[PDB]
Design a protein around this ligand. Structure first.
Ligand SMILES: Nc1ncnc2c1ncn2[C@@H]1O[C@H](COP(=O)(O)OP(=O)(O)O)[C@@H](O)[C@H]1O
Ligand SMILES: [Mg+2]
Lengths: 371, 70, 70
């Protein structure tokens, strides 16, 4: 048989068979419902629209995200998302396919318990497993040591790993992610005169952020340059025409990662959290952690993020140490690649959670050695 | 009598519309290439200043170690 | 009637012709900027390796001087 690798993530569901080079189906994790009445008779529109289908009908629907920060809030629509992924995008019955999932570090145990219960009862998969996103990302890069930063749309966390041995006491998890950056961009575009309120226009703001924003190596110098020069403004075309322009907001939005005080967060920037997590570890492994800094996640795809992060870490770390940041082109798909590699291993075949084993041991077995 | 004039006008309109559409398509292609090149060159210019500072204080502490060896 | 539509079509065709001329102008400007950026990046990425080897042997005899001083 073959294994199935599913990555629920947050804001983008990516799934595909184990052993493939890239995920087969990638679509937003969005479930929508029509807020209007509808006058045409015989149309027979169904109650709920899920996946990329709801994106095309954005103007009529309202969008709800079942995942806020890693955790799942609404479970019925989560079941709808999983059913859609299993039946329409992959067109495969999950009755004969083991399923591997990704789960962010430091999340409630009830999340894992309900996930396993749903996957074993509703879909009756023969076996399934849950793995950490950072470990899979380290699998994809081909490394075996080094501290990995996984900044997705839901949560940003650092996991220091040395020689295949994780250090749980040095794991730091931060709630700043892509969704908060999009919300801050919405809040900051009001200054120029553009107002976005409807959840449909959240997607437009997200597209603007993806296609236009960039990270500045130096902040005050860039502010001084933009206050006089006009070479930074770029124009974007809304779906209904009405071209707009944007200036300082082009690079002010991604600065929130390094300046959490912009959105009122107390914590420090990612550049400081990475250094603090490195210093929380031992002293004999800091060379490899410094020299094998790995980036991943969609939010990392900002151009110029690597240079700024390296500059900050070098400004923090001692000058003797060599600081290297690994930024593969396929950052946002690294976790799924690592999951496919992990599920394709021969020695992993005896680490699944079987059906009868779960039945006899109950849902609490997830937290046992079968982590 | 005017039917031929209308047909010719329609054909000309179609021809200029196709030429214009090709013109945009090339314009977005060239613009995307230009922005990608500009981003790449700006990033590597920033690399240039950082390696320049690297090199500068490299000769700084090299010279300091030089008189130390003296 | 048909005369109004023909006049409107002619005026629109003139407008899109002006837009076409602007499109080629912008394309030419973008191409010039692209080739200038290509020359700049060529110079920069043939000087980066010189800077790299420079700092390399800088730290090399930094280490030699340090060990001799010790
Ligand atoms: N090039 C990019 N520019 C800006 N943001 C990006 C880019 N690529 C991905 N993202 C952000 O990453 C988020 C999706 O993260 P992803 O890598 O799919 O993991 P997850 O689905 O678990 O969040 C999106 O919300 C998006 O805003
Ligand atoms: Mg992720």
């Amino acid at each position: 048989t073959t294994a199935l690798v599913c990555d629920n993530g947050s804001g983008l569901v990516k799934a595909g068979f184990a052993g493939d080079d890239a995920p087969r189906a990638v679509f937003p994790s969005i479930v929508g419902r029509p807020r209007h009445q509808g006058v045409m008779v015989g149309m027979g529109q169904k109650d709920s629209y899920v996946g990329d289908e709801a994106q095309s009908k954005r103007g009529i629907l309202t969008l709800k995200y079942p995942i806020e920060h890693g955790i799942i809030t609404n479970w019925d629509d989560m079941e709808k998302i999983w059913h859609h992924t299993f039946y329409n995008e992959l067109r495969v019955a999950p009755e004969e396919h083991p399923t591997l999932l990704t789960e962010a570090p430091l999340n409630p145990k009830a999340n894992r318990e309900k996930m396993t219960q749903i996957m074993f009862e509703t879909f009756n998969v023969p076996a399934m497993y849950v793995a950490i996103q950072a470990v899979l990302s380290l699998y994809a890069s081909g490394r075996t040591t080094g501290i990995v930063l996984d900044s997705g749309d839901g949560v940003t966390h650092n996991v220091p790993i040395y020689e295949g041995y994780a250090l749980p006491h040095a794991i730091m998890r931060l709630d700043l992610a892509g969704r908060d950056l999009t919300d801050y961009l919405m809040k900051i575009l009001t200054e120029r005169g553009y107002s976005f309120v409807t959840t449909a226009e959240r997607e437009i703001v997200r597209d603007i952020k993806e296609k236009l924003c960039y990270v500045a190596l130096d902040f005050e110098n860039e502010m001084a340059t933009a206050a006089s020069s006009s070479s930074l403004e770029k124009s974007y075309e809304l779906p209904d025409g009405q071209v707009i322009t944007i200036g300082n907001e082009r690079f002010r939005c991604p600065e929130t990662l390094f300046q959490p005080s912009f959105i009122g967060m107390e914590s420090a920037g990612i550049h400081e959290t990475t250094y603090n997590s490195i210093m929380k570890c031992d002293i004999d492994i800091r060379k490899d952690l410094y020299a094998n800094n790995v980036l991943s996640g969609g939010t990392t795809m900002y151009p110029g993020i690597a240079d700024r992060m390296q500059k900050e870490i070098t400004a923090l770390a001692p000058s003797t140490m060599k600081i290297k940041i690994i930024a593969p082109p396929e950052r946002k798909y690294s976790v799924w690649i690592g999951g496919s590699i992990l599920a394709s291993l021969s020695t992993f075949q005896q680490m699944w959670i079987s059906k009868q084993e779960y039945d006899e041991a109950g849902p609490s077995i997830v937290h046992r050695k079968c982590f | 009598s005017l039917q031929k004039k209308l047909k010719g006008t329609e054909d000309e309109l179609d021809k200029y519309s196709e030429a214009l559409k090709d013109a945009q398509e090339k314009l977005e292609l060239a613009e995307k290439k230009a922005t990608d090149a500009e981003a790449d060159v700006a990033s590597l210019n920033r690399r240039i200043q950082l390696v320049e500072e690297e090199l500068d204080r490299a000769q700084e502490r090299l010279a300091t170690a030089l008189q130390k060896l003296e």
